[PDB]
Write a protein that binds this ligand. Structure first.
Ligand SMILES: COc1cc2ncnc(N3CC[C@@H](Oc4ccc5ccccc5c4)C3)c2cc1OC
Ligand SMILES: [Mg+2]
Ligand SMILES: [Zn+2]
Length: 304
């Protein structure tokens, strides 16, 4: 509601600030603007939001702030591509973004597999992401939390499927193949948004874009966010060392001087191709790409 947030929330590079109690109203505002004050019952939605918050953990990066920030990036993409996605897709994607890291411990799928965690026996591929979706469903199934209760049974199954595919697509290992397919479709002119399977890929890429969006903020935000990202990675690295396994250098706090080189690698192999491809499909997302490039230049600056 405050006037500065009113204006600035429309910017792709908005940062949601340090006042946690404001983040729910920020999410409600985004969801009402992206699909009527009259869709979700307000008391039901508020109850849902607080239970989601509660099942996020106090880890350095994959926390409740990240969830809302990823939702905000989705809001921004959707607001600047009016008319492409249906009411149902927009509601589903925003809720998917809010829920997409539920009950995250700060550890990757690879660590969970190497640790032999029970979640890895339950869900062999995209382990944390299948968990995040299971948590979403369990929250929806609590008395008073079914924010989709006015939908038909068919539309409910539809939106849950939208949410499921969107959360799964946040498994970055899936992004490389997805992005390759989308680039082949762009270049041959075969991409068709009326084709559900194509549409699903586009939405997947949007989920990657939102999930990575720390690299599309202004430099001071991007830089400070990277401290939280590496704080989790280095903790996992420590855990890897404790299982008897040399971690990759990105996770090795002893190789912390190579952070800039590591960022260069990531921007070159992941972030820039991600936002390049997104911009080709959805040209109004260009500010994400531009901000990404500016941050690549800042990292190159750090190296000199
Ligand atoms: C802004 O900085 C970020 C932001 C991130 N957000 C989400 N997930 C990340 N990691 C998950 C597993 C890792 O997967 C890679 C795939 C391809 C690579 C190519 C080159 C370098 C690193 C790479 C990491 C990357 C990640 C890493 C980052 O910097 C190193
Ligand atoms: Mg995740
Ligand atoms: Zn995430």
């Amino acid at each position: 509601l405050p006037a500065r947030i009113c204006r600035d929330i429309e910017l792709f590079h908005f940062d949601i600030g340090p006042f946690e109690n404001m983040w729910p109203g920020i999410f409600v505002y985004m969801i009402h603007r992206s699909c009527g004050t009259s869709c979700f019952e307000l008391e039901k939605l508020c109850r849902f939001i607080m239970s989601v918050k509660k099942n996020y953990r106090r880890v350095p990066y994959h926390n409740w702030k990240h969830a809302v920030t990823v939702a905000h990036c989705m809001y921004a993409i959707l607001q600047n591509n009016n008319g492409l996605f249906t009411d149902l897709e927009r509601k589903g994607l925003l809720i998917a973004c809010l829920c997409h890291d539920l009950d995250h411990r700060g550890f990757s799928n690879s660590y969970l597999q190497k640790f032999d965690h029970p979640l890895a026996a339950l869900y062999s591929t995209s382990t944390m992401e299948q968990h995040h979706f299971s948590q979403t469903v369990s929250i929806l199934q609590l008395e008073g939390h079914n924010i989709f209760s006015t939908l038909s049974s068919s539309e409910y199954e539809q939106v849950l499927e939208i949410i499921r595919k969107a959360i799964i697509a946040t498994d970055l290992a899936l992004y490389f193949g997805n992005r390759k397919q989308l680039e082949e479709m762009y270049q041959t002119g075969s991409l068709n948004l009326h084709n559900q399977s194509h549409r699903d890929r586009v939405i997947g890429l949007m989920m990657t874009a939102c999930d990575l969006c720390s690299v599309t903020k202004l430099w001071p935000v991007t830089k400070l966010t990277a401290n939280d990202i590496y704080a989790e990675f280095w903790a996992e690295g420590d855990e890897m060392k404790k299982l008897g396994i040399q971690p990759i250098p990105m996770m090795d706090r002893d190789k912390r001087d190579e952070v800039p080189q590591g960022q260069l690698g990531f921007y070159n192999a992941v972030a820039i191709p991600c936002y390049t491809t997104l911009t080709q499909i959805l040209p109004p997302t260009e500010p994400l790409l531009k901000a990404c490039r500016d941050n690549l230049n800042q990292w190159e600056k750090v190296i000199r």
